[model samples]
Target: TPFAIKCATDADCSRKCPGNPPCRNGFCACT
Candidate 1:
């Protein structure tokens, strides 16, 4: 499976993003 973003809260964008992100899109903004 591909890399995915880490979810934090209900207002997180990573959970809503289409298709699993490869290493959080190089953002790593999640807590």
Candidate 2:
């Protein structure tokens, strides 16, 4: 699998990113 540009339509970058960004790098966003 590869990293995408956006999370709204792709895998939440948080899970894929290095430090699990709550809402950065294309994450869904923390609650």
Candidate 3:
């Protein structure tokens, strides 16, 4: 399966980051 953005966009992932997880190309990765 492909990785989906945990939130909506990069701006929506404010409190879900250890590595400042980025929503690149509309995809949010935990790595």
Candidate 4:
């Protein structure tokens, strides 16, 4: 259940954040 995590791609966020949120502006954000 991670959020607001630093990410490069969607996959990066997916590995960190749940629901595989998209990486926007180098940050993991829910869409």
Could you estimate the TM-score for every candidate? Answer: 0.21, 0.21, 0.29, 0.60
> What overall lDDT, based on C-alpha atoms, would model 4 receive against the true structure?
0.75
lDDT score at residue 30, model 3, on the 0-100 scale: 57
lDDT of 1 by residue, 1-31 (tens): 2234555433454466634433444432433
Each prediction's RMSD over C-alphas, in Å, is: 8.5, 8.4, 3.0, 5.0
Off by over 4 Å in 4: 1-3
Off by over 4 Å in 2: 1-4, 8-11, 24-31
Top candidate, metric lDDT: 4
Model 3: lDDT of residue 8: 69
Q: Put down candidate 4 lDDT per residue, 1-31, tens digits, no spaces.
A: 4546778888888888677777877888854
1-31 in candidate 3: lDDT tens per residue? Answer: 3566566666565556554566765566654
lDDT of 2 at 25: 52
Whole-model Cα lDDT per candidate? 0.43, 0.45, 0.59, 0.75
| Candidate 3 Cα lDDT to native | 0.59
Could you tell me the C-alpha RMSD of candidate 2 in Å?
8.4
State in Å the error of residue 10, model 1. Answer: 0.2
Q: Judged by TM-score, which candidate is best?
A: 4
Q: Regarding TM-score, does 3 or 4 come out ahead?
A: 4
The model with the greater lDDT, 1 or 3, is 3
